[PDB]
Subunit: 104 residues, 4 copies
């Protein structure tokens, strides 16, 4: 049990230290920026209430997927297709990072 | 095929070997903890039966996605958003582990 | 253009050669076995038409997600939760493999 | 922050550098090809407008998932199942690439 906590602590330190790498920071900011753009687009173009635009943006960008909503306009549909690849590009970025930071 | 059988067993041994690594155990406990918290949160704030709160918690945390349900309250939606990122955080954790154990 | 095809060919050979690794074979068989069990369970317990039980099994095991259907019984719900982790375990398996076969 | 700006630019350079690797180009062409085929298949067999066939093709091939639609015909369902595995096959491809370029 004490080992659990010590391991947990060492791992948490390593996670917080990751928030120090400038490339991880960029990816993070880019992600926030992407989530904000999505929130703006869906509230504007699809008329979704702000909190629902972020929710759709989050579930869509993370590949979780929305359970009922889907863009109603052709403009929304196109944006979403593009939004999704941006999301995949970001994930690969993080993955590429975790791939380099491990092989150094 | 004995050959096939032997390969499976070797793999299974390597799997159970991971369930011994402390870091993997932490990650595992944390996801169960996360699943429980989720099950609790959705039972309370969204008022789902426990089994349906666990289900939504699972399909949501793993990025599988629910086919019909989605948080009705603002609290539920905000929680779900953070929940998903915890899930991503956890998966990166397991992945980093799998990329550290290869070396 | 000729390079495209040559690269494409070399990559395809490498993919087919992967179908030779006994561990990849096991993971593959395990996956088929898992998809068959799912197809049987959902058709039986949830009364889904066979082709729909496989479809749900596939979209669920791959994290794609079903757009409308979800287990109606508590038995189905429990099985699905477990089904999902089996699926994640298999994915990590493949990933672990692609991680070793690259660092040899 | 110039520092932040410089980091971004370095990363962007490394991204465009990948769009030069032949193997990555193949993988990319193959997914576009796959997306087109999907868009075509769902337009015909399921009778969706092209933009809705592309959308379902995308959300399906990336594992994001559609919130309401799903193939109505048996042909559509069988195709979708194989489509998803092509998608998994493609992602493993990009991943293997990202794990070969690290070394
Ligand atoms: Ca999904
Ligand atoms: Ca739905
Ligand atoms: Na997913
Ligand atoms: Na995924
Ligand atoms: Na869904």
């Amino acid at each position: 049990m004490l080992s659990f906590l010590l391991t947990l602590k060492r791992m948490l330190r390593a996670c917080l230290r990751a928030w120090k790498d400038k490339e991880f920071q960029v990816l993070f900011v880019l992600t926030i920026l992407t989530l904000i753009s999505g929130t703006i687009f869906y509230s504007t173009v699809e008329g979704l209430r702000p909190i629902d635009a972020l929710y759709f943006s989050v579930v869509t960008l993370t590949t979780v997927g929305a359970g009922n909503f889907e863009p109603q306009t052709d403009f929304g549909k196109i944006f979403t297709i593009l939004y999704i690849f941006i999301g995949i590009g970001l994930v690969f970025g993080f993955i590429h990072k975790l791939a380099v930071n491990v092989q150094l």
